[PDB]
Structure formats: structure tokens, C-alpha cells
Amino acid sequence: ASQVGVIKPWLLLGSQDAAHDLDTLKKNKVTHILNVAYGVENAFLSDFTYKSISILDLPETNILSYFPECFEFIEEAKRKDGVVLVHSNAGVSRAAAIVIGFLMNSEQTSFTSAFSLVKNARPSICPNSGFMEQLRTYQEGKES
Structure with a gap:
């Protein structure tokens, strides 16, 4: 009974339950799955392109430090005319x-x-x- 959010036509946001729900991954046209929790299994290894980046949900975690590895993979899905689910736990x-x-x-x-x-x-x-x-x-210096 998970419910993903649609951020872009090609970018979904959800939970481990969504990541483990093959019926809805297929309905939602997912091609890529970006797993940014800790220790959540990638359940359908032959069915999707996966990338996993371990992150702990703690205020001392520097979320900014994971950005280039995550964003390039999101862009891969866009470039390939697919859909990425970004999920954690x-x-x-x-x-x-x-x-x-x-x-x-x-x-x-x-x-x-x-x-x-x-x-x-x-x-x-x-x-x-x-x-x-x-x-x-984030990016206050860049934006000036």
C-alpha cells in the first residue's frame, strides 16, 4: 500500500515498500532505481538499473556530500528516456x-x-x- 510521489515525469520519490513493489514499479514505467537508504535490498536485480549509495538519516550526515553520485544517475534515467525511483527506507x-x-x-x-x-x-x-x-x-555562494 505504498504511494510514490511524481516529482518529474521521469523522477519518482518513495519508500522501501515502493522499491519492493514489482507490480507498481512496472505500472509506473520504472527503469532505474536509486537506493539511498542503509541496508535495503535491491529486490529485482535483472529488471532495473540500480545504483545504491549508503546514507544514514542523522542530522550529522552531510547530505550535500552524496549529491554528485545521486544526481548523475537521476540524469542517466532522464537521458535514456526512462523513469528513476529515488527511494530510501x-x-x-x-x-x-x-x-x-x-x-x-x-x-x-x-x-x-x-x-x-x-x-x-x-x-x-x-x-x-x-x-x-x-x-x-546549498549553493548560496554559486547563486550570489
Whole structure:
């Protein structure tokens, strides 16, 4: 009974249950799965292109440090005319922060606008307060 959020036509956000739900992965046209929890199995190894990046949902984790590895893989799915599911465990903090940061990086949209888009798509998000503050500061130097 998971419910993924649609962030872009090619970018979904969800939980480990979504990642383990072959019926809905197929309905949703998923081609790529980006697993950004810790210790969640990749259940359908022959069926999807996977990338896994271990992340702990703790305020002392620097979510910014995982961005290039995650964002390049999201872009792979887009470039291949596919659909990536970005998921973690509950799918409300690690994976949410990755997607918000992806939007900020790829479109230079603001934190508040990216956060609002993602929460409207997936109303359960609630990133840890460390991730929140990290995302607020992200690319302030660049944007000037």
C-alpha cells in the first residue's frame, strides 16, 4: 500500500515498500532505481538499473556530500528516456533531501520552491533538521 510521489515525469520519490513493489514499479514505467537508504535490498536485480549509495538519516550526515553520485544517475534515467525511483527506507528524509537538492542543482530553483514541490507530490516528507538546514544553505555562494 505504498504511494510514490511524481516529482518529474521521469523522477519518482518513495519508500522501501515502493522499491519492493514489482507490480507498481512496472505500472509506473520504472527503469532505474536509486537506493539511498542503509541496508535495503535491491529486490529485482535483472529488471532495473540500480545504483545504491549508503546514507544514514542523522542530522550529522552531510547530505550535500552524496549529491554528485545521486544526481548523475537521476540524469542517466532522464537521458535514456526512462523513469528513476529515488527511494530510501521510510522515504521521508534521505530520499526527500536528495530529490530537493537535485531540483535545486539541475534547475537552480530555490529551496523553498523545491521543498514545496516535493511535499505537494509526497505529503509525508519530513527531512531531519540537519538536512533541512544543509539544503537551505546549498549553493548560496554559486547563486550570489
